[PDB]
Ligand binder design. Structure first.
Ligand code: NAD
Ligand code: NAD
Ligand code: FNR
Ligand code: FNR
Ligand code: SF4
Ligand code: SF4
Ligand code: FES
Ligand code: FES
Ligand code: CL
Ligand code: CL
Ligand code: NA
Ligand code: NA
Ligand code: NA
Ligand code: NA
Ligand code: NA
Ligand code: NA
Ligand code: NA
Ligand code: NA
Ligand code: NA
Ligand code: NA
Ligand code: NA
Ligand code: NA
Ligand code: NA
Ligand code: NA
Lengths: 156, 418, 419, 158
């Protein structure tokens, strides 16, 4: 019953045709799906498996393994907050407090409107700019609540 | 076009090689790259035999910048002893805490990396190369895709590159959240469209790698050196820095320093010089308590006069420098390291799977003051028993840094024990 | 790093805009600036068209703070109607007696100025900007050079700033002792490596400026407002203070007050309020005799209920308030003003050259009781005849304050004439 | 002796300024400040080589030196004590500062101490009027409070 909208199916086909072998495209495909829906729809995996010429079992195992993928919560904007050593030293907890003040949620939670989800993540490889966070693909140093509020206001 | 927002990591160089352009926090596209002599080393390389290129890279003494320090030329030599086809892979998975050296080459000077990849691929006779970049570097991914297109348009990629008869395509793959996919065999498994589960080694990738064919995996920073070895020759390259450990090195410095960022320095620089001479000293001029070499090693304030080289008494690792000062709780920091290994064991090996989990779970109890006597003794035991039967380096080192803190800061731990 | 010693000028604000940081007498570096939302207006601006930015600055009603009150947005419009390349110049020559408002932004909150320079430069399509800072502000110079390096490091300067495709370098030039190099055309001459000799205007710099190209010159304080216009939007900015003279203003207050310093106040504040409400009243509670508006105007104690705005009946100038009280000799004060103009005429124009000289020469004889009848009449004549043929504002105003003292304090002058 | 040459350490600084702006001639004032910092004055013989470095005629450079009041071709001094003689400082005590300077140092405006150490330079408003009366010692700037206070300040300049 579940079918990819044509615009998405087109993009997935592009990924599948990109590498020498179709199955190599699996992660690019899952990234694309998550970008489109705000999460990985469980019902998307069987059709994807068919495009990759892989068993469903295989695709499900890959989704489970890779931490960037989320099959449970739809969110327009994922706020990834680094919780590793350097950001911890330099103020992760201030960033989290500022986020709770602005958005009213904590790590793992989604806002009621489905707009923002806070995702605790390991080192983002921007340690000199600790504490670090991303909003979908954009990445930022946290300076203060006033500063963060202005950044978040850019995402509508 | 436009790329995702990136923080502007500070970068500084005394050598003006890897950071000649990347010291400025912006994308340098192919026209700017060409103005500086970009791709001329490739053109030179294509007029050389693969064997000669391998020889120069060997004689340069270049060692892997991905943490293990394996001689690059030797690695390449091993690959070409085996029948083709062969594959070349650039490891851009950079996910160890504190480590952000590779991204500034990728994001700011992508052509330096691409040029290196083409030369390297030519040297080992690979017609198919890959960049595996972590999923949390989306800007790096788009920057690379666009830079590869630029290189194609200028005739540096594709069939019969510059009339040489050498063919090459570079594919960019993305990770999706697993630190273990930086381990070369798990990376290859991920490239094959599977879970990132390390394979038993040997065989090494150079014997049996992608699709079971000879495969060279090298780190971004390693590959970024190749242009220079061809351009300058190996003799001049060996005159960079100390004769014993020659070449430029990138040092990502973070934590409690005034000038956190990436420093390009020779490897005779000391840890003390990195912190005080280059990175502006400590925040508040507080005393250094410890340096974490990423999530691998913990150096105390008594060990700052060591060289940043691949020597037995040297800093080693990837040159990652996380500075903790006198008010930083060592047990709290240790917990963060335990948490990383908990979140990144792939779970194939039993002591690694159980040990990384229990190390973190028990250390959290200790930190919060809820640990029983049994929990303390269990913590000690587990920390010492993550490595048995491990098939990759994660299980081998998941207890390492924490053990060093137990040995180096006993008084601080003892206060938690009581 | 270590900077030269600077006196700790008192600063106070009722608005908390230009002096939010600069009310504290120390350098605020980029990290502190970023914590308060620094450079976020730049980021907003770079997502706008230059044309939009010009429009906002126009609609804000911002007028030049360098003394002439020319509408800033309109100045920018005049520049961009002319083919590029174009140049942006920040005038930090601040050298008029009594005036020390600009230095506290430079020395304490340099990024506020730099942020403004970048936004303004983007708005007019200038890829090269200058700060021309007087030579006697060496600390300001070093602080600015270091702050510019900080902005570069964070990617707010250089090529392709924050992916916008806009390129900018800011160069810091130093003066070397001439008040006339604050006149925008002499400034440009100085930037070109020449003596600071004003040019005939028109053309205005916006048509023909540095290397003959369209050039916008704006004062430090003008530029320090730009961040707020973009951040708040022009409408909310225009709601600050009285709607006809909207926005924050800096008032450097000196002389015989209890709390001399820089005050950030709205422009409906009266001169009396500046002195008595903000600056703590007079030293010794003595009566105000006169207020010198820098070296430009002399207001009597009968004129304290005027607004600190740019209206015809308002204070005008740059808001420079020098307070004299009842025992201060007006002729002695006038002599100091004459001496200033003597020292600063560039000499290109004959009545200015000879007039500034003779005004001071004769007024000295008067002060010392050595003046002949002919010296008195000559003094009166010279004072009235400095302006003719003058090509810049110095010649136009070199006699102005002194003439006002002659009209407003005749009894004091008469005591010298009978002597 | 021989054609005057800039010491390399000065020459390096001069070249840095010359390379800073888009056009060499823009660096003329920064160069002259550098020269006066190094020598304690502008040596007349320094101008021809500067002119060559700036690619300017000598007469242009000489005219610039003459024009700008901060530059001094006549008197070498290690420390220039710039004393504001404009309106606000006059009102608030320039004359007391000048007296204190004369008591401490034995010199008046325009004069140099016999040891070459200090020159008193009368200047127009230094833009620190709220802290009148104002003076500078080279690049450092101060409010004058009293002779005792001034003496302690001058003691820092060795
Ligand atoms: N990362 C860091 O690296 C280490 C763990 O990483 P690793 O498991 O990749 O390290 P490793 O020491 O097993 O190997 C490093 C590199 O050299 C190659 N190599 C090693 N011995 C070889 C041989 N005999 N023949 C051919 N190739 C050979 C490996 O394939 C790999 O590419 C740790 O020190 C960790 O901090
Ligand atoms: N300083 C104070 O400023 C005044 C004199 O300074 P000034 O000579 O710079 O003042 P001004 O009135 O000549 O000009 C003020 C500013 O507006 C600009 N300007 C004026 N008319 C213009 C026009 N028609 N087209 C384009 N731009 C125009 C000038 O170039 C300048 O930047 C005095 O009041 C003095 O005290
Ligand atoms: C757990 C774990 C994680 C990583 C690695 C190892 C292990 C055990 N390695 C090292 C990798 O396996 C391999 O040695 C290098 O990529 C080889 O390249 P060089 O010889 O260093 O150029 C590794 N290498 C790299 O280039 N980037 C990375 O992110 C990581 N991550
Ligand atoms: C003699 C003399 C001296 C000065 C000026 C004028 C004249 C006639 N002007 C005013 C300058 O020419 C110009 O109007 C402004 O710099 C324009 O900027 P705003 O429109 O005020 O922002 C001026 N402006 C300024 O910003 N700082 C200064 O030190 C001086 N000095
Ligand atoms: S040691 Fe740990 S991370 Fe490595 S293969 Fe075994 S379980 Fe996976
Ligand atoms: S009016 Fe006076 S200061 Fe202005 S240009 Fe003429 S002589 Fe020079
Ligand atoms: S520890 Fe947070 S980005 Fe590295
Ligand atoms: S009058 Fe002396 S500093 Fe202004
Ligand atoms: Cl296939
Ligand atoms: Cl030139
Ligand atoms: Na296939
Ligand atoms: Na298949
Ligand atoms: Na919204
Ligand atoms: Na180069
Ligand atoms: Na170059
Ligand atoms: Na060899
Ligand atoms: Na980068
Ligand atoms: Na291919
Ligand atoms: Na910083
Ligand atoms: Na808009
Ligand atoms: Na100040
Ligand atoms: Na330029
Ligand atoms: Na030129
Ligand atoms: Na001495």
């Amino acid at each position: 019953e579940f079918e990819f909208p044509e615009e998405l199916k087109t993009k997935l086909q592009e990924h599948i045709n990109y590498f020498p072998k179709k199955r190599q495209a699996i992660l690019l495909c899952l990234h694309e799906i998550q970008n489109y829906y705000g999460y990985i729809p469980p019902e998307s995996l069987k059709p994807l498996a068919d495009m990759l010429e892989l068993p469903l079992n295989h695709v499900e195992g890959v989704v489970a393994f890779y931490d960037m993928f989320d099959r449970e919560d739809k969110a327009k904007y994922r706020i990834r907050v680094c919780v590793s050593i350097v950001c911890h030293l330099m103020g992760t907890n201030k960033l989290l407090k500022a986020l709770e003040n602005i958005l009213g949620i904590k790590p793992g939670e989604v806002t009621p409107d489905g707009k923002f989800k806070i995702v605790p993540v390991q080192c983002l490889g921007a340690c000199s700019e600790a504490p670090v966070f991303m909003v979908n693909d954009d990445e930022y140093k946290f300076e203060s609540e006033v500063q963060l509020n202005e950044i978040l206001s850019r995402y509508t | 076009r436009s790329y995702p927002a990136i923080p502007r990591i500070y970068a500084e160089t005394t050598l003006n090689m890897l950071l000649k352009r990347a010291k400025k926090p912006r994308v340098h596209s192919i026209d700017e790259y060409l103005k500086d002599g970009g791709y001329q080393a490739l053109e030179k390389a294509l007029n050389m035999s693969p064997e000669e290129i391998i020889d120069w890279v060997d004689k340069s003494t270049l060692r892997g910048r991905g943490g293990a320090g394996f001689p690059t030329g030797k690695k390449w030599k091993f690959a070409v002893q085996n029948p083709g086809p062969r594959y070349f892979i650039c490891n851009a998975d950079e996910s160890e805490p504190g480590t952000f050296k590779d991204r500034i080459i990728i994001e700011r000077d992508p052509h330096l990396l691409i040029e290196g990849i083409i030369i390297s691929s030519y040297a080992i006779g690979a017609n198919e190369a890959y960049i595996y970049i972590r999923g949390e570097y989306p800007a790096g991914y788009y920057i690379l895709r666009d830079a590869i297109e630029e290189a194609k348009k200028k005739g540096f990629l594709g069939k019969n590159i510059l009339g040489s008869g050498f063919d090459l395509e570079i594919y960019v793959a993305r990770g999706a959240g697993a630190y273990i996919c930086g381990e070369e065999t798990a990376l290859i498994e991920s490239l094959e469209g599977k879970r990132g589960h390390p394979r038993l080694k040997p065989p090494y990738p150079v014997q049996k790698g992608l699709w079971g064919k000879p495969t060279v995996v090298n780190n971004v920073e390693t590959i970024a050196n190749v242009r220079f070895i061809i351009s300058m020759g190996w003799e001049e390259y060996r005159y960079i820095g100390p004769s014993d450990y020659a070449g430029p090195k990138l040092f990502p410095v973070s934590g409690k320093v005034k000038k956190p960022g990436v420093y390009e320095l020779p490897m005779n620089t000391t840890l003390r010089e990195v912190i005080f001479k280059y990175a502006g000293g400590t925040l508040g001029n507080k005393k250094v308590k410890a340096v974490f070499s990423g999530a691998l090693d913990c150096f105390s304030s008594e060990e700052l006069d060591i060289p940043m080289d691949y020597s037995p008494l040297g800093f080693g690792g990837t040159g990652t420098v996380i500075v903790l000062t006198e008010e930083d709780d060592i047990v709290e920091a240790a917990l963060k390291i335990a948490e990383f290994y908990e979140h990144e064991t792939c779970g194939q090996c039993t002591p690694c799977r159980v040990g990384c989990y229990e190390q973190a779970n028990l250390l959290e109890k200790i930190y919060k003051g809820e640990a029983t006597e049994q929990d303390w003794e269990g913590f000690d035991f587990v920390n010492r028993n993550i490595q048995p039967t491990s098939i990759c380096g994660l299980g081998a080192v998941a207890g390492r840094l924490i053990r060093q803190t137990l040995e180096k800061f006993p008084e601080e731990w003892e206060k938690y024990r009581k």
